[PDB]
Amino acid sequence: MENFQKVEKIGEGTYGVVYKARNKLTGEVVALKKIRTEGVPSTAIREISLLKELNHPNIVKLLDVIHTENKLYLVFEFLHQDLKKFMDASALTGIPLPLIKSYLFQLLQGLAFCHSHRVLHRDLKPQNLLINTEGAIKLADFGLARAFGVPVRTYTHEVVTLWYRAPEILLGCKYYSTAVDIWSLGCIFAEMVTRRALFPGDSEIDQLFRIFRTLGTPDEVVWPGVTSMPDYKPSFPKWARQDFSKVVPPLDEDGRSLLSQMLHYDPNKRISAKAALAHPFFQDVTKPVPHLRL
């Protein structure tokens, strides 16, 4: 590192390996992601560079985009833990409702900000949500999907998680909208509540059918235009919708109501982040401190 000092290898992101590193000069501790290939598309560097100006308290700060030696590195502010690890650590007792609500409220503020600036995430998941000791939670990797390209694999034959993908993406829609992020966040909200992934599909069709088995196979009534989607097949089985009370028990009606609006099939009916922030569920929102063991 011409200016760093790898503290250790965090993990293996969807784009490349991620390291915790310390800037030798400033002494700042950061997350360094080496991006995956043979020249680095100039189209990508310009788009990524624009994300440096996208700051909000609930968005992981992109500190630098380094294009040198024909390689691409992204330098991000560092946070000590992700929501996936936190949920596993809170598996026995569950994350307290006040903290679940605080986190959801903060993530929606983060999404409202990105979306108002025409920036989508497209691949939200527990591992991309970072938390600190102060009770803050932040979204990591916003806009990388568009700037770069389709995921599929990390960089070393690793299985892409489809659990949080919106149905319109699974049905082959080529144009993503802000709604895909709201869907993923609804899936995460449900998971924090029940302590089990809502739709743990192990293939694109299994993912789609797990959604259908729970929310009902969509039709033209609830989702105008669904039967004309690229990958829609008239042969899809027709499952009846399950009662929401059985999906995320023992969540209260305010919570179930908000979740139902975040999981509407029609992306156009799906609630926006701005509107979700005003939902009665957040009437008593607070900002608790989590018990974090680092």
The answer to whether the annotation marks 232 as part of a ligand binding site is: no
Residue nearest ligand X73, Cβ-based: 31
Closest to ligand X73 by CB, 10 or 66:
10
Phi, psi (deg, nearest 5) at residue 32: -115, 120
Q: Is 78 annotated as a binding residue?
A: yes
Look at the alpha carbons of 50, 53, 59, 65 in this order and tell me if their dihedral is positive or negative: positive
Query: What single string gives the DSSP state of each residue in 77-135?
Result: E--SEEHHHHHHHTTTT---HHHHHHHHHHHHHHHHHHHHTT---S---GGGEEE-TTS
Asked if residue 132 lies in contact with residue 79, where contact means CB atoms within 8 angstroms, the answer is yes
Closest CA to 130 of 148, 103, 95, 98: 103
**Binding stretches for ligand X73 (CB under 6 A):** 10-11, 13, 18, 20, 31, 33, 60, 76, 78-82, 130, 140
Strand order in the sheet with 29-34: 6-12, 17-22, 29-34, 71-77, 62-68
Backbone dihedral region for residue 121 (phi beyond 0: left; psi -120 to 50: alpha; all else: beta): alpha
Closer of 60 and 162 to ligand X73 (Cβ): 60
Task: Look at residue 188 and give its three-state secondary structure.
Answer: helix
Query: Any binding-site annotation on 79?
Result: yes
Q: How many CB atoms lie within 10 A of CB 158?
A: 12
156 carries a ligand binding annotation: no
The token pair that represents 104 in the structure block: 């959801």
Q: From the CB of 63, what's the least distance to ligand X73, in Å?
A: 10
Task: State which H helix or E strand residue 30 sits in.
Answer: strand 29-34
Nearer Cβ to ligand X73, position 66 or 173?
Answer: 66
Min separation Cβ 20 and ligand X73, Å: 6
- The closest of 292, 294, 293 to 103, measured between CA atoms, is 292
161 is in an annotated binding site: no
Least Å from the CB of residue 251 to ligand X73: 27
**Shortest distance, position 13 Cβ to ligand X73, whole Å:** 4
CB-based contacts of 250, cutoff 8 Å, min separation 6:
none
266 is catalytic: no
Q: Do the annotations mark residue 125 as ligand-binding?
A: yes
Q: Which of 123, 231, 252, 284 is catalytic?
A: 123
Cβ closer to ligand X73: 82 or 191?
82
Closest CB 14 distance from ligand X73, rounded Å: 8
Consult the annotation and say whether 254 binds a ligand. no
Question: Of the two residues 82 and 123, which places its CB atom closer to ligand X73 in the complex?
Answer: 82
Which residues are designated catalytic?
Answer: 123
Q: Which residues are annotated as a binding site for ATP?
A: 10-18, 33, 77-79, 82, 125-128, 141
Q: Which residues are annotated as a binding site for Mg(2+)?
A: 128, 141
